[PDB]
Design a protein around this ligand. Structure first.
Ligand SMILES: *[C@@H]1O[C@H](CO)[C@@H](O[C@@H]2O[C@H](CO)[C@@H](O)[C@H](O)[C@H]2NC(C)=O)[C@H](O)[C@H]1NC(C)=O
Ligand SMILES: *[C@@H]1O[C@H](CO)[C@@H](O[C@@H]2O[C@H](CO)[C@@H](O)[C@H](O)[C@H]2NC(C)=O)[C@H](O)[C@H]1NC(C)=O
Ligand SMILES: [Cu+2]
Ligand SMILES: [Cu+2]
Ligand SMILES: [Cu+2]
Ligand SMILES: [Cu+2]
Ligand code: NA
Length: 499
């Protein structure tokens, strides 16, 4: 069952064996992935998060981010530790009480402390639209049509060297999959469809690192949503999905009744499908209960290319139709050396006082804010352009901005900008050497918004900055509840920190 929009959510430690290898984890709702949190557009969500964690090897503090929800007027509920709150300590709880005006689509939630989400605290978050403009394109859209793609590690996150090329031990599809080494024939996930029906498949990358080449043997996929933004219909036979991205696609169950492989090939770790790694099963009602015998093609003739995507609505692009044609045009220098990433010469290290609390206490320009050099102020009601030229090791880097989505004016692997009708999204691959992926948005949401690579190992190694958007209006726009004001005293008391 789905839970929400008003629910408790317990965060616990437990052993799990999603690929047949047992290890301890950090879990929401006792499962991997966590339960789906759902509601309708415009609903009030009140997710009371109970921190019941006791195992220090995966951290006993926690904080949860609602990925892709704008949090307008509720910056305090966004979740990134040391940016919008101090962590929740064990044996305490915290009500994330916010609203989702003007958004409907496929989202997710995850720990936003250190690399803790890798250890298991990740699940889907869906905001349905009762008047969805795409409703007539499918028959079925429910918890059974959500498809999660996850990387899974046998080594605990806090034992992963900072800045390393960290590699997973299994791909999990809907929580199940087989290990790349010492492969055992442990259970694969089954997605069941009825011949003739059309399904809104909600494809969610809950990855900590790899991107996946996702396809379904014998089937194509008609994309209708990108990171929460409705798209024009685009039919493809393969989707390359980067960490934290989401797509909805229509699956037409129009092939002969039978069993078909679902494939998710990561860019690192195990390559291919031997022993059923990187796989799940699409089963038609009435098919024999047996593994598929289908084959992938040698190449995919209609793969997703990001510049083919266009919004369903006339969203346009803010600003003027040329590079630098914005009120505040930025170019970030994105680098990696010696185990640490940097942005504009500064490697992100979380401050002791959360950025939002520094601003509410009166720090009112970005040079007064800590970490020094890691906070950039944005002016209010202005068009912002951010170029993100690639080249830093460990790519392709999927960059994500909190508090916003953005027009993708220039995509990976294509030097041509689009100032007319590019897709809008919230997490974008910045591509490869020589690319100049560029995003635009308007500043109508005061507060500190994190900008970072969503490969969680890279964030931990410093690949982040904070946009302090409209510092002067942050306090009036974001009144804070007492429980939020209580978090930093409680956390600092528990950890013997002075401030
Ligand atoms: C990416 O595009 C940005 C502009 O969006 C380019 O920025 C210019 O960089 C040159 C020096 O490289 C400066 O003279 C300009 O002031 C910058 N802003 C402009 C022209 O609007 C950036 O060079 C591009 N990077 C790559 C790798 O192509
Ligand atoms: C490279 O990106 C550009 C810009 O998004 C794409 O150019 C568009 O191509 C569409 C489809 O043919 C045309 O309708 C638009 O007028 C083009 N826009 C511009 C600004 O040129 C281009 O197709 C992409 N390249 C590849 C190989 O997909
Ligand atoms: Cu996220
Ligand atoms: Cu986010
Ligand atoms: Cu990265
Ligand atoms: Cu984040
Ligand atoms: Na415009």
């Amino acid at each position: 069952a789905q839970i929400g929009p008003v629910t408790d959510l317990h965060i616990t430690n437990a052993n799990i064996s999603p690929d047949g290898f047992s290890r301890p984890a950090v879990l929401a709702g006792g499962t991997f992935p966590g339960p789906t949190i759902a509601g309708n557009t415009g609903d009030n969500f009140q997710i009371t998060v109970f921190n019941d964690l006791t195992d220090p090897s995966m951290l006993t503090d926690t904080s949860i981010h609602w990925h892709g929800l704008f949090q307008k007027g509720t910056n305090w509920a966004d979740g990134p530790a040391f940016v919008t709150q101090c962590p929740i300590i064990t044996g305490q709880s915290f009500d994330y009480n916010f609203n989702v005006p003007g958004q409907a689509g496929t989202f997710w939630y995850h720990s936003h402390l250190s690399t803790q989400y890798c250890d298991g605290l990740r699940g889907p978050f869906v905001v349905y639209d009762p008047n969805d403009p795409n409703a007539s394109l499918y028959d079925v859209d429910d918890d059974t049509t959500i498809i999660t793609l996850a990387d899974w590690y046998h080594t605990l996150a806090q034992q992963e060297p900072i800045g390393a090329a960290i590699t997973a031990d299994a791909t999990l599809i809907n929580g199940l999959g087989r290990s790349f080494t010492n492969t055992t024939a442990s259970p694969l996930s089954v997605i069941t469809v009825q011949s003739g029906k059309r399904y809104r498949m909600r494809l969610v990358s809950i990855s900590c690192d790899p991107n996946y080449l996702f396809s379904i043997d014998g089937h194509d996929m008609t994309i209708i949503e990108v990171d929460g933004v409705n798209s024009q219909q685009l039919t493809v036979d393969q989707i390359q999905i980067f960490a934290a991205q989401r797509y909805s696609f229509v699956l037409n169950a129009n092939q002969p009744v039978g069993n078909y492989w679902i494939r998710a090939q990561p860019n690192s770790g195990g390559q291919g499908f031997d022993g059923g790694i990187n796989s799940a099963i699409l089963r038609y009602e009435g098919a024999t209960v047996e593994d598929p015998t289908t084959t992938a093609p040698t190449t995919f003739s209609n793969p997703l290319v990001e510049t083919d995507l266009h919004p369903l609505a006339d969203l346009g692009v803010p600003g003027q139709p040329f590079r630098g044609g914005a009120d505040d045009p930025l170019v970030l220098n994105l680098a990696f050396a010696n185990g640490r990433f940097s942005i504009d010469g500064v490697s992100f290290v979380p401050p002791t006082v959360p950025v939002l609390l520094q601003i509410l206490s009166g720090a009112q320009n970005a040079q007064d804010l800590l970490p020094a050099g890691s906070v950039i102020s944005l002016p209010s009601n202005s068009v912002i352009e951010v170029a993100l030229p690639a080249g830093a090791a460990g790519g392709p880097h999927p960059f994500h901005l909190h508090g916003h989505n953005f027009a993708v004016v220039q995509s990976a692997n294509n030097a041509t900008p689009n100032y007319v009708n590019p897709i809008w999204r919230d997490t974008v691959s910045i591509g490869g050497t020589g690319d100049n992926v560029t995003i635009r948005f308007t500043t109508n949401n005061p507060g500190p918004w994190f900008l970072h690579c969503h490969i969680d190992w890279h964030l931990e190694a410093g690949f982040a900055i904070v946009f302090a958007e409209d510092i002067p209006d942050t306090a009036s726009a974001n009144p804070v509840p007492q429980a939020w004001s209580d978090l930093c005293p409680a956390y600092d008391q528990a950890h013997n920190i002075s401030t």
